[PDB]
Amino acid sequence: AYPMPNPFPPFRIAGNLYYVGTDDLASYLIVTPRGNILINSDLEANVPMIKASIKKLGFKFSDTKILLISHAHFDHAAGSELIKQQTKAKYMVMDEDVSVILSGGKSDFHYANDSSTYFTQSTVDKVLHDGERVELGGTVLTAHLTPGHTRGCTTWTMKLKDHGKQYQAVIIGSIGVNPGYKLVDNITYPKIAEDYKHSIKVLESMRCDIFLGSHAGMFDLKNKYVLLSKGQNNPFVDPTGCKNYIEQKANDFYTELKKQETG
Ligand SMILES: [Zn+2]
Numbered sequence: 001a002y003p004m005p006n007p008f009p010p011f012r013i014a015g016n017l018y019y020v021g022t023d024d025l026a027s028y029l030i031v032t033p034r035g036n037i038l039i040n041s042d043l044e045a046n047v048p049m050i051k052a053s054i055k056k057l058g059f060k061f062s063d064t065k066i067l068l069i070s071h072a073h074f075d076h077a078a079g080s081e082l083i084k085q086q087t088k089a090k091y092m093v094m095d096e097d098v099s100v101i102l103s104g105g106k107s108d109f110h111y112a113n114d115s116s117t118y119f120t121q122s123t124v125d126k127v128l129h130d131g132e133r134v135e136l137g138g139t140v141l142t143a144h145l146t147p148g149h150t151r152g153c154t155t156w157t158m159k160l161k162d163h164g165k166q167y168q169a170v171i172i173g174s175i176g177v178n179p180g181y182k183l184v185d186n187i188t189y190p191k192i193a194e195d196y197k198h199s200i201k202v203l204e205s206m207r208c209d210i211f212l213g214s215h216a217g218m219f220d221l222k223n224k225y226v227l228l229s230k231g232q233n234n235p236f237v238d239p240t241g242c243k244n245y246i247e248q249k250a251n252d253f254y255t256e257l258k259k260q261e262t263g
């Protein structure tokens with residue numbers, strides 16, 4: 001079973017982007033004059049935690065206008081129906097992952113026959129596409145299709161002003177190869193390996209100043225938060241860590257491909 005995350009103190013990352021997630025499953029709040037955008041609903045058990053984090057920062061849960069996700073797996077999206085019920089936020093999802101969201105996991109190319117991965121069915125209010133913007137109150141997020149991990153895995157980007165300076169924030173959706181994924185002659189998702197390769201090409205050439213992700217461990221949340229509490233100049237500005245993480249995951253993909261082809 002998925003390890004239950006622990007609470008994590010919410011904080012401002014940069015500009016109008018806040019962390020409202022856990023010590024593992026990462027969620028983000030973008031605060032605008034016309035309401036807020038929430039990224040990742042996490043597990044059903046985490047929805048009260050997200051609400052509490054939002055309110056701890058002095059914001060209103062009822063001001064959540066838009067709900068986005070990194071990708072259509074239960075650990076990022078299971079809480080979405082509850083959030084929609086409690087806030088009436090509009091749920092927007094990349095085209096290629098909509099089937100999984102509508103089916104609560106039953107159409108997943110890999111986990112269709114693993115009921116431990118299923119989650120509450122919901123409807124999608126707006127279907128997104130590669131390069132499409134999500135705009136609220138002058139804030140502009142861009143959805144980048146970085147497929148492989150899921151068919152519609154989304155890497156979210158935005159530009160943030162921090163201490164008078166401009167930074168591109170990148171929330172890496174995931175380019176991990178899960179244990180058991182088949183990369184050669186995949187029966188349900190034949191383009192899986194081509195998709196990962198495309199994601200690698202996109203991410204390797206992407207400007208990345210503020211390095212974030214769907215999981216805390218991708219981007220060193222805990223150690224960076226400690227630096228932030230100590231008053232360090234934005235430790236979440238980490239272009240070198242971003243470059244190195246993308247390169248590591250690209251290498252991990254090719255390592256797994258080598259194992260499947262030659263091992
Ligand atoms: Zn996943």
Ligand SMILES: [Zn+2]
Binds near residue numbers: 073075076214215
């Ligand atoms: Zn995950």
